[PDB]
Design a protein around this ligand. Structure first.
Ligand SMILES: Nc1ncnc2c1ncn2[C@@H]1O[C@H](COP(=O)(O)OP(=O)(O)NP(=O)(O)O)[C@@H](O)[C@H]1O
Ligand SMILES: Nc1ncnc2c1ncn2[C@@H]1O[C@H](COP(=O)(O)OP(=O)(O)NP(=O)(O)O)[C@@H](O)[C@H]1O
Lengths: 589, 181, 159, 602, 208
DNA sequence: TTTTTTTTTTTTTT
């Protein structure tokens, strides 16, 4: 393998020329020892492939083409270099970027030639085969002859190059027959995983279904990504396994299940605000009509319903949280529902909450099993371990669940749905594992009138379609009438017609920032009013309609707090409460 | 306004070009004709080698009062020496009569009877000849740059059929390149 | 000019901020727009807006299609990238920006783009699949004259 | 093998020598396809039988032992064609088709096994791409001897010769070459020969340039070879390896798609647009069977073209094209009509369910009981995406995903959060509702609403809703009753339509290619004022149905109804192949839904 | 919002270039857009209306403001823009029609452009007058030669020399010139290239 | 030289 060293001395020139990589190299080499001065760093480096055409194109192409012959000596080169660095006081890894490609492709298609080559391939993460650590290097200590003894085990999944079947036994008393004890806490174990990726369902060509394919995640790549996330996954596509021709079994056509090793795994759509941007965020934040402004831009086509819009943004903040000490939490995230005659744009309105909201996942009615319930993947998958897997609502943790036809979901689902909102967790007894896992989620749905257009005529009782405690947990019930005004109908027409014929993306960039910086806490000014308001409700709102509870007031907290994040005020203020007093009026009238 | 083609010549036309070239024939016949570009002749000796223009020979062969000679370049054993030269010279296109592809179709259409065993032979040899020559063309096409072109030996049919592609492209090349300054 | 593509080529907006205040807004009620207000503008007007001011009326930030992103994107595997997706008027355009702004490197790159493209484009001389969709308009027409040349040629070749 | 090498020479001969006057078709085809990177050639077995009978007589005898040889020469042929030497050049594929002679599936047993069989059937479901070996090499686990196997087709375990033993070899995975394999599951044609029983499905397998050539659920023709393999007495599984496959007419279509072009189409499609009768002659394409019912008859057309689908940012997108109701008294012809409609669609699924025939009307994800792990099983709506929706018995549809119909028609999607998978998958499918109304004509003296299940909202979900009322009335019958006995024997009305073919009428297998054609060009759109006209028309439709409701009548109208009538405009316009739509153009779409407004008034 | 309106038109010019380009060639230009150019024209007259107004305004309170200096260097550009669009639209619209002239008249005995170029009414009258005036001009090229040409005829090279043409539902005979060949439905011949050229373009003759 | 597997989805049913 003289050429193996040739790839290295070719790339050795690339070491220090250009040296723009050595900065982060050294940086790892420093922040590790700075954590060593504490009182965690991964070893691997992003390399934009873009630069490499500026040295050897002849080396460039093969990096994608036959990485088994190229990437391991340059891999060795990272380690070689970094070892030449200070200071005395590990195999490393790589990623790259792209800057692609041939080799630009989506998971929907692959092979023949596409195999055995570096590729970037993007998409949905499912089903997340769960983590187990893996054996690589063996080590043992002889006595009384002493010394230190070892082996190095190599799976077909490790590295790239084909190698003799190392596995699987401890060397165990190498000659002369001296006892050899496992070196545990010495010998190397890198964690391993296999994660399939489904191509985006909407970009599917035809009635043909989505096809996922697995990608092995070694070292860091594990725990980086949960299921359901959009991820560009890069690495080299291995031809793996016997062709059924290893043995007499089986006499058949089928064979060669295969996946991709390495490499990078970037998430896609967080975010990156620099300075110049957030300066705009705050420049706008100063303006006092901006709440309404942000509300209007939500629905480019849709008419008005600005009170509903506001309500949505109020859910888009999260309305902070407060966790008790040694007691149960006070839910701060906001749960609402839409109701009204068909063609209210309720479903389509949900589809706006599909993209800007930074998750979570929406569902049409069904739904289940238990939605966010894991429903206990069974049996095992794999190696004799019964496993759970992310359910809808779980995947939706700290995100937006949305529902088309929450009225059409089963009565049996509703049980765990109560468990979704008050208890705000997930209880699992099924086989099984008894874990109570956090279900804390922002949840909005829509329901149609139980019977026809009578949504307006009939009392809310019987118009519910989903009694009862379901109604309590809802911060708002929104009745939207299809009722006719020809005066309005002209307006209804023209904007709808100019349809087919204040910026939202920035709205996401702003909302995200308003979450973490900052939480408002509270001031007594809102308190000096909304109390008067609540009792005012109870002594009045019962002479009109129902219901009224303490909970509906707790929403005054959440609502006010939501707009409090909208003002980006470091604290809650009275006028925010006035925004709440606004929203609940139109909630019941 | 010709519209079509327009810069390049139609193969249909270029055949009209080559049809104006001189060749030998074997007359059946023993006024004048006067014509224009003909000169010759007085009543032309029957069953003897004689030089005329192609298209006249085409027409009198259509009356079969003449017989067209196979060009001495066109033969099996000859095509072999040339195509062999072609394989052992990956860059140069060797040497050809230059109106030939047209001549081939032209003669095979009518003059077919005069040759000895052109059938199922030459059409293959020239198909292959045109083949290795065609790949020599296409492979030469990566050196394409402004402003220089050596096509050296290439036939007018060969060339004209591909004319628009190098011409039109090369302009997009040179224009932008000198435009840089 | 009198090829539709010439008036059509300037139909592309380029990022440009003005170096001056411009009373009499070209678009609505400024009426002036303050210096360094970012705007996408058609090349036909913009082209001269640099030539006259000796400081110009307009700053002219680099276009989104000439980004290092795309410029090396083409450098990776020229055949695969879809030119129709980018503008689609590019060689009909990039020529104009490389004239107006007078760059020297990207040229030597771009020419090679068209080269490789044509290396492939000739290979379609013989009588698509996914490819035929993704070509630029001039890249689409070169195909016309080239192909149709052959398309007549073979029909002559036999009867 | 030098015998096989003489056969090799025989095929090299076959290619270089062969002539159709005068170009050598396969020879041209090669250098044509090498720049396509097709690396394959489709050869008529008749030019072969015309070239030398002998080689076929032995080819037809054990083709399996020869077909690769046939390739080993033509892969060499490219060597003497593609380039000159003194890379890497992939081993060729060959695809051979022939007119041949058709054989029915039910009669396929033993006998013809290990030979060529032309036959059609229809594919049910596509297997996932499965890659297979082409070249592989191996070092020994013990002696480190370097072996090189060319894996060829058409099992065969790895050879053990340089303890060393028993078989010490493991694949060099790094250096190996590869190909895809499809594993077609395909079904016999619906018509023959079921006798009494259920349709069989016999499994076949594509590879290389054959893969993904055929959609799930489309009529197709495969030639291939009848063979067997164990696959856990001797009881080995029947199958057919695939060469070559050809689509039944066309089918081409997929993807993006095809023309190609055969120029006469554009002209002939434009002349259609210059024919003032074209809209109406399409109407006369739809029912050679059905004389009359011209209203709904005009209503079918506008759906198939696809209507307005406009995606405007943000992710908001409005559907196309729409929905239609055939509900009316039996005698409507609407099932006969629908059985025209589905055959018209380039790609669609006919559902009388419940869901069709055995289909979960929506895709129902079902665990593979082997190796666990739920996988989505597909669905009628799913497979029918970008195609027609056929529904009978809509009185009886599955109530739970009835809502997934209540949704997929609109949001162009179905969300499955069930089990593991959250993917919201596309049904852009356009529904036509053919169900029979409750009690026939008895809902006419009643409230015509709530006719469909327990809610009126389904109507809103639909668009072009049409109530077909046939009274026993005079002379409109006596002419269609006259039409009848002609229709039956001797097709005295089906001859009368063939002189209208020469005079006027469309061929309707054409109509497929028409609607395939103009659905792939970008979406048509109305000029502003026809829209404002939709505004003053509808302000009075809505005004009228509040005033109609001055009687406190329960009901019907929405704002998706106006928009519904919008999409009909771009439909009827997409007929025209015109980016715009004229005022009156839109107007007969108005008169076209106007009957449904009186369906609201009745 | 400004010089854009013409871009719709030049786009249409693209498509109508495509309607002659392959095409296959039936010509038949869709229409002169009389409405839209006039929209442009009301803005092109509006532009120099604004500019003439500013030419008044520059003289009073603007005082040759460096920005006031701009809009002459600015709006006038859109004047050139429109001009470009309109010009090239019409140079297209004409080059196509002059081509439609050259090919056929058409040919004997043209004997008239009447019913030829079926557009007739649909083609705008300024172009109608122009075109017919232009083939009036081309008749003078029939005057200049004195070949005889038959520029309109004899486009493709001769061969050889005799062909078999079949008549399609055509009578006939108009054959008074030369000699009378008696045109009947389903009538073919064996005849020299010469006489072919006219009734082959006249549509009467067919097979070559 | 062999290893090892019961929920979840849907269904037809009193
Ligand atoms: N501003 C708007 N207001 C109302 N509807 C609109 C508006 N703009 C568009 N629409 C359309 O109105 C329809 C709304 O349907 P929608 O109610 O959201 O679905 P749905 O509720 O699931 N059907 P249903 O369950 O019966 O209520 C869609 O076709 C939208 O495209
Ligand atoms: N133009 C026509 N109009 C009416 N009936 C026709 C026509 N042509 C044929 N028929 C005959 O009448 C029947 C028309 O179908 P029809 O009686 O309406 O049943 P259907 O409603 O389509 N089926 P279903 O959807 O379950 O109600 C056919 O069975 C034909 O025999």
């Amino acid at each position: 393998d003289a050429v193996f060293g040739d790839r290295v001395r070719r790339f050795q020139e690339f070491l220090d020329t250009f040296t723009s990589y050595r900065d982060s190299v050294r940086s790892i080499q420093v922040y590790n020892s700075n954590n060593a001065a504490n009182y965690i760093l991964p070893h691997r480096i992003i390399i934009s492939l873009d630069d490499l055409r500026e040295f050897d194109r002849s080396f460039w192409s093969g990096i994608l083409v036959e990485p088994a012959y190229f990437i391991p000596p340059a891999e060795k080169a990272l380690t070689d270099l970094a070892d030449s660095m200070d200071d005395v006081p590990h195999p490393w890894k790589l990623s790259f970027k792209g800057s692609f490609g041939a080799h630009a492709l989506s998971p929907r298609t692959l092979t023949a030639q596409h195999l055995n080559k570096l590729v970037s391939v993007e998409g949905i993460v499912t089903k997340t085969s769960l983590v187990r650590p893996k054996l690589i290097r063996s080590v043992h200590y002889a006595a009384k002859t002493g010394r230190f003894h070892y082996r190095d085990y190599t799976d077909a999944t490790t590295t790239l190059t084909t190698r003799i079947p190392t596995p699987a036994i401890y060397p165990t008393e190498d000659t002369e027959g001296n006892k050899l004890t496992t070196e545990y806490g010495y010998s190397t174990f890198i964690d391993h995983q296999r994660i399939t990726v489904q191509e985006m369902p909407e970009m599917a060509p035809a009635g043909q279904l989505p096809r996922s394919i697995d990608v092995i995640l070694d070292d860091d790549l594990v725990d980086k990504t949960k299921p359901g996330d959009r991820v560009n996954v890069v690495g080299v596509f291995k031809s793996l396994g016997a062709g059924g021709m290893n043995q007499s079994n089986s006499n058949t056509l089928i064979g060669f299940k295969t996946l991709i090793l390495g490499n990078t795994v970037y998430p896609l759509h967080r975010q990156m605000l620099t300075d110049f941007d957030i300066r705009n965020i705050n420049k706008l934040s100063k303006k006092k009509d901006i709440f309404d402004i942000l509300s209007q831009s939500l629905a480019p086509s849709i008419y008005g319903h600005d009170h509903i819009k506001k309500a949505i943004l109020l859910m888009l903040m999260g309305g902070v949280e407060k966790n008790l000490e040694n007691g149960s939490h006070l839910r701060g995230d906001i749960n609402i529902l839409m109701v009204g005659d068909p063609s209210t744009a309720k479903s389509q309105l949900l589809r706006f909450v599909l993209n800007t909201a930074s998750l979570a996942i929406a569902t049409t009615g069904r739904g289940s099993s238990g939605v966010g319930l894991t429903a206990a993947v069974t049996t095992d998958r794999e190696t004799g371990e019964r496993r759970l897997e992310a359910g809808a609502m779980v995947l939706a943790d700290r995100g937006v669940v949305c529902i088309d036809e929450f009225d059409k979901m089963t009565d049996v689902d509703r049980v765990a749905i109560h468990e979704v909102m008050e208890q705000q967790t997930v209880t699992i007894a099924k086989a099984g594992i008894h874990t109570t896992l956090n279900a804390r989620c922002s949840v909005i749905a829509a329901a149609n009138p139980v019977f026809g257009q009578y949504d307006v005529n009939r009392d809310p009782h019987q118009n519910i379609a989903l009694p009862d405690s379901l109604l309590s947990r809802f911060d708002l019930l929104f009745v939207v009438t299809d009722d006719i005004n020809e005066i309005r109908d002209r307006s209804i027409s023209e904007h709808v017609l100019r349809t087919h014929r204040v910026t939202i993306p920035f709205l996401r960039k702003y909302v995200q920032y308003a979450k973490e910086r900052v939480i408002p806490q509270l001031t007594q000014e809102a308190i000096n009013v909304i109390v008067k308001n609540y009792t005012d409700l109870r002594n009045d709102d019962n002479t009109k309609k129902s219901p009224i509870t303490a909970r509906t007031l707790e929403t005054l907290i959440r609502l006010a707090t939501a707009h409090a994040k909208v003002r980006l005020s470091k604290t809650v203020n009275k006028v925010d409460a006035k925004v709440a007093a606004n929203l609940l009026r139109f909630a019941l009238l | 306004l010709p519209a079509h083609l327009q810069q390049t010549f139609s193969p249909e036309e270029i055949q009209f070009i080559v049809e104006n070239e001189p060749i030998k024939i074997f007359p059946r016949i023993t006024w004048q004709l006067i014509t224009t570009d003909d000169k010759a002749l007085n009543n032309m000796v029957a069953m003897r080698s004689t030089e005329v223009v192609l298209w006249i020979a085409l027409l009198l062969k259509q009356q079969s009062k003449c017989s067209i000679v196979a060009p001495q370049w066109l033969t099996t054993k000859e095509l072999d020496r040339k195509i062999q030269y072609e394989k052992t010279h990956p860059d140069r296109f060797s040497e050809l009569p230059w109106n030939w592809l047209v001549l081939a179709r032209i003669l095979f259409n009518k003059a077919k009877d005069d040759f000895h065993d052109p059938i199922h032979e030459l059409r293959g040899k020239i198909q292959d000849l045109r083949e290795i020559r065609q790949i020599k063309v296409l492979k030469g096409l990566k050196y394409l740059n402004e402003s220089h072109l050596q096509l050296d030996n290439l036939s007018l049919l060969e060339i004209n059929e591909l004319r628009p592609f190098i011409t039109e492209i090369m302009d997009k090349l040179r224009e932008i390149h000198t435009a840089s300054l | 000019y009198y090829d539709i593509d010439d008036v059509l080529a300037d139909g592309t907006e380029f990022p440009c901020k003005f170096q001056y205040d411009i009373p009499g807004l070209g678009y609505n009620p400024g009426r002036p727009i303050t210096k360094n207000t970012k705007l996408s503008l058609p090349l036909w007007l913009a082209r001269i807006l640099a030539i006259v001011g000796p400081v110009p009326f307009v700053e002219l930030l680099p276009p989104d299609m000439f980004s290092t992103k795309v410029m090396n994107a083409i450098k990776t595997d020229p055949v695969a990238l879809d030119l129709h997706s980018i503008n689609s008027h590019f060689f009909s355009l990039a020529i104009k920006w490389i004239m107006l702004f007078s760059e020297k490197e990207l040229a030597n790159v771009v020419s090679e783009l068209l080269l490789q493209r044509a290396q492939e484009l000739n290979h379609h001389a013989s009588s698509t699949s996914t490819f035929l969709l993704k070509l630029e308009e001039m890249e689409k027409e070169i195909y016309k004259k080239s192909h149709e040349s052959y398309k007549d040629t073979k029909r002559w070749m036999f009867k | 093998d030098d015998d096989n090498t003489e056969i090799i020479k025989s095929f090299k001969n076959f290619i270089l020598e062969f002539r159709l006057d005068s170009q050598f078709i396969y020879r041209d085809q090669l250098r044509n396809n090498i720049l396509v990177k097709n690396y394959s050639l489709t050869v008529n077995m008749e030019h072969l039988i015309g070239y030398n009978e002998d080689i076929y007589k032995k080819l037809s005898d054990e083709p399996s032992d020869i077909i690769p040889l046939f390739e080993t020469a033509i892969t060499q042929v490219a060597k003497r064609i593609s380039i000159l030497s003194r890379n890497s050049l992939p081993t060729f594929q060959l695809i051979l088709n022939s007119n041949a002679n058709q054989i029915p599936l039910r009669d396929l047993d033993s006998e013809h096994v290990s030979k060529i069989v032309r036959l059609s059937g229809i594919i049910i479901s596509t297997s996932v791409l499965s890659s297979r070996a082409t070249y592989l090499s191996i070092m020994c686990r013990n002696c480190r001897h370097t072996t090189s196997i060319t894996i060829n087709n058409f099992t065969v375990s790895l050879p053990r010769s340089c303890n060393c033993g028993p078989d010490p070899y493991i694949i060099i995975h790094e250096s190996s070459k590869f190909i895809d394999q499809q594993f077609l599951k395909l079904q016999e044609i619906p018509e023959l020969v079921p006798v009494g029983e259920m349709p069989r499905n016999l499994t076949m397998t594509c590879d290389r340039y054959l893969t993904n050539k055929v959609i799930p659920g489309t009529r197709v023709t495969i030639v291939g070879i009848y063979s067997i393999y164990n696959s856990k007495v001797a009881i080995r599984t029947p199958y057919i390896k695939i060469l070559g496959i050809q689509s039944d007419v066309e089918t081409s279509s997929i993807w993006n798609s095809v023309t190609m072009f055969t120029e006469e189409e554009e002209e002939e499609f434009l002349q259609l647009s210059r024919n003032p009768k074209l809209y109406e002659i399409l109407t006369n394409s739809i029912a050679p069977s059905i004389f009359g019912n011209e209203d709904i008859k005009k209503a079918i057309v506008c759906l198939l073209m696809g209507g307005s689908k406009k995606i405007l940012p943000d992710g908001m997108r409005l559907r196309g094209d729409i929905n239609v109701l055939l509900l009316g008294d039996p005698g409507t012809a609407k099932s006969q009509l629908l059985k025209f409609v589905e055959k018209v669609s380039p790609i669609a699924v006919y559902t009388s369910g419940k869901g069709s025939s055995a289909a979960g009307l929506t895709a129902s994800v079902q665990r593979d009981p082997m190796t666990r792990e739920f996988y989505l099983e597909g669905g009628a709506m799913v497979l029918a995406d970008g195609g027609v929706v056929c529904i009978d018995e809509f009185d009886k549809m599955r109530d739970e995903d009835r809502v997934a119909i209540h949704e997929a028609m609109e949001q162009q999607t179905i969300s499955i959060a069930k089990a593991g998978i959250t993917t919201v998958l596309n049904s852009r499918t356009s529904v036509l509702a053919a169900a029979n109304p409750i009690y026939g004509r008895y809902d006419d003296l009643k409230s015509p609403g709530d006719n469909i299940d327990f809610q009126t909202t389904i109507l809103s979900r639909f668009d072009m809703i049409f109530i077909v009322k046939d009274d026993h009335n005079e002379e409109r019958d006596i002419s269609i009753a006259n039409h009848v006995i002609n229709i039956h024997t001797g097709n005295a009305n089906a001859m009368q339509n063939q002189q209208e073919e020469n005079g006027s009428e469309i061929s309707i297998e054409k109509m497929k290619r028409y609607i395939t054609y103009c659905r792939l060009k970008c979406a048509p759109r109305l000029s502003p004022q026809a829209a404002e006209k939709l505004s003053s028309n509808f302000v009075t439709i809505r005004k009228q149905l509040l005033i109609n409701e001055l009687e406190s009548t329960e009901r019907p109208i929405t704002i998706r109804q106006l928009e519904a009538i919008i999409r009909i405009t771009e439909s009827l316009a997409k007929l025209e192949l015109s980016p715009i739509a004229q005022e009156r153009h839109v107007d007969e779409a108005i008169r076209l839904f106007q009957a449904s407004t009186m369906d609201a008034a009745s | 919002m400004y010089g854009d309106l013409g871009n719709k038109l030049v786009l249409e010019a693209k498509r109508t270039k495509q309607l002659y380009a392959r095409s296959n060639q039936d010509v038949n230009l869709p229409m002169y857009h009389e409405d839209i150019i006039r929209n442009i024209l009301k803005e092109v007259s509006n532009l120099r209306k604004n500019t003439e107004y500013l030419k008044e305004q520059q003289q009073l309170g603007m005082l040759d403001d460096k920005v006031a200096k701009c809009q002459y260097f600015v709006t006038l550009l859109c004047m050139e823009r429109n001009k470009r669009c309109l010009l090239a639209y019409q140079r297209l619209r004409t080059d196509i029609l002059d081509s439609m002239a050259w090919n056929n008249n058409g040919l004997d005995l043209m004997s008239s452009i009447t019913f030829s170029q079926q557009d007739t009414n649909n083609l705008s009258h300024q172009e109608q007058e122009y075109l017919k005036e232009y083939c009036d001009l081309i008749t003078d090229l029939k005057s200049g030669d004195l070949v005889d040409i038959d520029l309109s005829g004899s486009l493709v090279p001769p061969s050889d020399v005799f062909i078999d043409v079949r008549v399609l539902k055509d009578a006939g005979e108009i054959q008074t010139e030369y000699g009378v060949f008696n045109l009947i439905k389903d009538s073919q011949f064996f005849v020299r290239q010469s006489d072919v050229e006219r009734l082959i373009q006249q549509g009467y003759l067919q097979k070559i």
